[PDB]
A and B are shown apart, each in its own frame.
Chain A
Amino acid sequence: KRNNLRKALQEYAAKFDPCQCAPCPNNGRPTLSGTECLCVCQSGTYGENCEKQSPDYKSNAVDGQWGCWSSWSTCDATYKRSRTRECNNPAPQRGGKRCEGEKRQEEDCTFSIMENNGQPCINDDEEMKEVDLPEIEADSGCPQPVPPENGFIRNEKQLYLVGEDVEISCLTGFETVGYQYFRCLPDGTWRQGDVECQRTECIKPVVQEVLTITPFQRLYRIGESIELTCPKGFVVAGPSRYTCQGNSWTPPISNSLTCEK
């Protein structure tokens, strides 16, 4: 309602901005009810819309005020539209004075992209609810089970129904022995079992800011090898070549081949 209400104020101003009034006599500000303009008068000016003066006020003649904006000049060759106004209510002729506030606007050429289809309800406090408590959950079913060692749930939901199923499998180094779905039983359990992750690949270990290693591959198959390497002219720590072992290699990672380059 706030967004819409700014947006209505923009349209309301476009319709009812008193810039559209004929020039105010004796340097009053034009003001518009919606259906009539009246001028707000300066000290020493009076009448319905400022038409007459006290004998002292006649000395001013400063006369600095706007007429309306032009419509938008379309995009400026950096995709920004603009518009300008021209100081052109009764001009600073006998005396001299600037009309106040920046003569021009620039506004990004923004337009709509998608099928309009109404508007959604939004309230200030809500959006920062990254976490909230588990619901009353009367459609009992099951919540997400914690997947096994090195595991990943393929289809993700808050609450799976009775007889509804979830698929799992091991991460990139690894493969499932056994059946890789589970299903929510009527009591709320998953009966997780008869599945086991096995290693088939290994991944470039964590190393110091000097590369003490040569990165041959994204993933290394078990029985392949990786090499610790000095950039030039020295030897420091760790095996020169290593092969992977169902576990990781037992690689040097507290320190690596940090040679005197």
Chain B
Amino acid sequence: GVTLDPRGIYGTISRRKEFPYRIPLDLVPKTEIKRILSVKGLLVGEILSAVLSQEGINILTHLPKGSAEAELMSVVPVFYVFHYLETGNHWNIFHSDPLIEKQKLKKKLKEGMLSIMSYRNADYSYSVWKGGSASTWLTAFALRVLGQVNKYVEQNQNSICNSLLWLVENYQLDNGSFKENSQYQPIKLQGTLPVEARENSLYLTAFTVIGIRKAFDICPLVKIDTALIKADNFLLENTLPAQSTFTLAISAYALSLGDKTHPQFRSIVSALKREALVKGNPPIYRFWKDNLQHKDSSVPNTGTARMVETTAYALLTSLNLKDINYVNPVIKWLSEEQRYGGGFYSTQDTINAIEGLTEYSLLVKQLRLSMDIDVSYKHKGALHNYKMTDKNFLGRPVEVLLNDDLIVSTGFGSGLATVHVTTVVHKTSTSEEVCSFYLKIDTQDIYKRIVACASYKPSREESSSGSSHAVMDISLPTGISANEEDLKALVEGVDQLFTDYQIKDGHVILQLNSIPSSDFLCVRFRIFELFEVGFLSPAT
């Protein structure tokens, strides 16, 4: 069986699957072969209505641009508020014509691209001023953003690749793997906190991997693949950031875009679980903190930034593992004043909050059940067709009849319904590897007496050492009873073979230490009948 997936979930996509037809050797000769297929509509569960407001226009329409590129703080979150509205159908909520707002966005966003590009150095780095000393951190923020917007408006690949190759050539260390030029200062509402006391290499290696991963889809050349594999691996091998969840979370989030099924990544998120903050008996709200230094600030601070960035990265880690059940109590935490401001107009935080709702609302539409599913044979024709919706979620079994390979498929659509196929078969004792101890029995009048005869069979490479310990069952028709006091000879006799016996469910059970393969071991017992039934089933 499989999930179907018309849209991409679980690091892959699953719009088609094919199940073979097999012919085992063990089979009972004149058998019929039977199969059943059924499909379960895996609904989203609840959806939490987490959104940017109409005030999302104020997040586009940035706070005053200026020197030290407060113009940069004015460009960058446009490249996210676009992406939210685009994945949200949200312009309708503005109550203009949505097309006029979409055209306005595409234009203002292109003006944004020229505006950010104006801070590019001739080395394809960037700086705090056009004449400033270069920064890899800001080169990596630009690469994170360019990685976003080429999903929407294209810019030439060389303009990306040279900015990548500045960073990837000149600052890719070993035993620790991305490095920085010591810019004049961290910008007081951009950048973020480093690893504070020391040891900023984790925040660099993560934030730089995060930029490079976003861009890498639009500069796929061999060098950059060669770089990210080690920029991840040195991040992974360093990543035990217990001194800060903010460092554990940016390192987790970076690695969430990586191999989502690498054990160290899984282990990092398993620590991120152990770091979580919750409320309620089941998780009603969920978030994260690291530095327990606290005040209940009505105006936010870098202490809030520790939370909102560590959480937005945990949220984005979880939302790259595609599970709304895990993500929900976080999305409940956002949007209402836990520690205020939606990123507080720190660009770094506010970006990571908008990115949160974006990947959440994308996953919401990816998960909903609106899917049509088809099943056919491979050489033979169609078997059935199914339509799966907010009502018709249960896809009843249909017989599978025609002895051929079975193909299930879907188009585009949405959701994650799962299709299960069961096969039923009946198999022989003698013509299969299930039997090591080959059986015979005879009933004779000399009330009556019964003699079983049987022998062991070693593997081709093995001597006649005999069978292991075994549990043996002599079934009898109901109301027939064995001579137990004669049976005691199998227990009392000096030539012992059986340890013990019992009667259970009307069957006679006895337990045997070993069995010869040199010859058939034969055993005899006697029976009396209080005949109980008109029809008797065959005894085993």
**A interface residue numbers (CB < 8 A to B):** 2-4, 6-7, 10, 74-80, 107-120, 122, 126-130, 132, 135, 150, 152, 154-158, 165, 167, 171-172, 179-181, 204, 209, 211, 215, 217-218
Contact = CB atoms under 8 A, between A and B. Distances in A.
11 contacts: A3-B337, A75-B63, A110-B340, A110-B345, A112-B55, A117-B336, A120-B336, A126-B278, A127-B289, A179-B1, A215-B233
Interface residues of B, number: 76
B275 A79 contact: no
A183 to B, nearest CB: 9
Contact of B259 (A7, A75, A172): A172
B342 A157 contact: no
B364 to A, nearest CB: 15
A127 B354 CA distance: 24
A112 B341 contact: yes
A129 B286 CA distance: 10
- Residue among B274, B296, B326, B332 with the highest chain A CB neighbour number at 10 A: B296
A116 B282 CA distance: 25
B439 to A, nearest CB: 27
B418 A165 contact: yes
Given A115-B53, A127-B277, A179-B1, A78 B70 contact: yes
B1 A180 contact: yes
Interface of B: 1, 3, 10, 40, 49-53, 55-56, 58-59, 63-68, 70, 73, 174-175, 187-190, 229-230, 233, 259, 261-263, 266, 274-279, 281-283, 285, 287, 289, 296-300, 323, 325-326, 332-338, 340-347, 350, 353-354, 357, 418, 420
B261 A172 contact: yes
B266 A171 contact: yes
Contacts of B261: 152, 171-172
Given A113-B350, A127-B278, A130-B275, A107 B299 contact: yes
Contact of A108 (B53, B66, B300): B300
Given A10-B298, A110-B345, A111-B345, 13 more contacts: A6-B298, A75-B64, A110-B300, A110-B344, A113-B53, A113-B55, A113-B341, A114-B336, A120-B285, A171-B266, A172-B261, A172-B263, A211-B174
A109 B341 CA distance: 10
Contacts, number: 164
Nearest to B187: A78
A24 B282 CA distance: 59
A77 B279 contact: no
A208 to B, nearest CB: 10
Contacts of B56: 113
A91 B342 CA distance: 43
Contacts of A120: 285, 332-333, 336-338
Contacts of B73: 79
A80 B188 contact: yes
Contacts of A76: 66
B298 A109 contact: no
- Residue among A75, A158, A211 with the highest chain B CB neighbour number at 10 A: A75
Contact of B296 (A6, A78, A155, A180): A6
Nearest to A8: B298
B1 A181 contact: yes
Given A108-B299, A211-B174, A78 B189 contact: yes
Contacts of A116: 53, 336
Contacts of A122: 279, 338
Contacts of A167: 3, 418
Contacts of A155: 323, 325
Contacts of B281: 132, 135
A78 B52 contact: no
Contacts of A75: 63-64, 66, 70
Given A114-B335, A172-B261, A79 B70 contact: yes
B50 A3 contact: no
A215 B10 CA distance: 27
Nearest to B58: A111
